[PDB]
Amino acid sequence: VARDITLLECVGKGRYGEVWRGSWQGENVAVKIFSSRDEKSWFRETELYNTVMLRHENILGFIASDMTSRHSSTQLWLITHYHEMGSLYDYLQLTTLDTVSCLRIVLSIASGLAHLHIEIFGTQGKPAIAHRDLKSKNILVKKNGQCCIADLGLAVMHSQSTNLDVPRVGTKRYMAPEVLDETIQVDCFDSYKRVDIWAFGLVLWEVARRMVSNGIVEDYKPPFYDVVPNDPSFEDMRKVVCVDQQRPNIPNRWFSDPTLTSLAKLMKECWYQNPSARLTALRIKKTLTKID
Numbered sequence: 001v002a003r004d005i006t007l008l009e010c011v012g013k014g015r016y017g018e019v020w021r022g023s024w025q026g027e028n029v030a031v032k033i034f035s036s037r038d039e040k041s042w043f044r045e046t047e048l049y050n051t052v053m054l055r056h057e058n059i060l061g062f063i064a065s066d067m068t069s070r071h072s073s074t075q076l077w078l079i080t081h082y083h084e085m086g087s088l089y090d091y092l093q094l095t096t097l098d099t100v101s102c103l104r105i106v107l108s109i110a111s112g113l114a115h116l117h118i119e120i121f122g123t124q125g126k127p128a129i130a131h132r133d134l135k136s137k138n139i140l141v142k143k144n145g146q147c148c149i150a151d152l153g154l155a156v157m158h159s160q161s162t163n164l165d166v167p168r169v170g171t172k173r174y175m176a177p178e179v180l181d182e183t184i185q186v187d188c189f190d191s192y193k194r195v196d197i198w199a200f201g202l203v204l205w206e207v208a209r210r211m212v213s214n215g216i217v218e219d220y221k222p223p224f225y226d227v228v229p230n231d232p233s234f235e236d237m238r239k240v241v242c243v244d245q246q247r248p249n250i251p252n253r254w255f256s257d258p259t260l261t262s263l264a265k266l267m268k269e270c271w272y273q274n275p276s277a278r279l280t281a282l283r284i285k286k287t288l289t290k291i292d
């Protein structure tokens with residue numbers, strides 16, 4: 001079991017629980033400890049790795065899952081590979097980017113998101129999966145320059161068979177207009193895919209600001225840094241996105257670079273108020289693959 005693991009250092013804490021860096025047979029591993037209030041998030045994220053056999057170069061790599069439960073207490077561990085460089089959010093604050101490194105990040109995310117979204121058939125197939133909490137803090141930077149998508153505790157699934165949610169359980173800063181509007185068609189699975197594309201558009205913006213061009217770059221800032229306070233409320237986001245119909249502003253420098261200009265058009269096509277008008281994960285991958 002994973003009782004042979006040494007918990008060295010805590011790297012993340014929050015409502016979900018905690019994530020620890022740990023050692024196991026000489027190798028660093030990440031250990032997510034779920035509080036007993038997140039037990040269903042533990043099982044869901046485990047079942048995707050345990051039963052659906054979720055694996056992809058840009059999805060966080062599962063290692064093991066353990067639950068031990070007495071009447072005294074219950075422990076819930078999810079064990080995955082460890083990524084020293086941390087989250088895309090931490091990375092972007094300490095690093096600038098160039099044409100190649102930026103593309104590798106962006107295309108890497110689009111590849112992981114599209115594999116999540118696309119249903120696969122057969123004995124080794126997978127249902128369509130919606131993340132529902134895409135954001136820079138849930139994307140990890142790998143040593144090789146690529147990224148992988150991490151937290152799947154809120155993901156939903158859809159297969160070719162009648163069948164996974166009630167409402168709005170994501171990070172409010174990244175919620176799409178139809179979520180803040182409550183216009184979202186909760187009964188159409190594509191609705192949740194289009195929510196991810198909105199979040200992915202914000203992450204594209206975050207990354208692009210950090211790509212240097214013509215000797216200039218932008219400090220890191222979160223989406224909507226200029227119009228909402230830290231930890232914005234549901235009403236604050238609805239006012240900026242729906243009523244004021246605000247969108248992250250595009251610096252004028254982006255248009256003097258080919259890469260940044262292509263990204264700008266991609267972002268905007270992820271931000272249409274109408275979800276049906278937004279690009280798909282696959283077409284975002286294709287477009288990104290053709291750049292440079």
Ligand SMILES: COc1cc(-c2cncc(-c3ccc(N4CCNCC4)cc3)c2C)ccc1C(N)=O
Pocket residue numbers: 011012019030031032045060078079080081082083084085086087090140150151152153
């Ligand atoms: C086990 O499962 C998850 C694991 C991770 C995850 C995997 N490898 C690395 C990290 C990580 C390590 C260090 C940091 N830095 C904090 C700021 N200072 C610099 C170091 C950031 C991230 C993590 C969090 C992520 C999500 C899950 C999950 N299942 O949601």
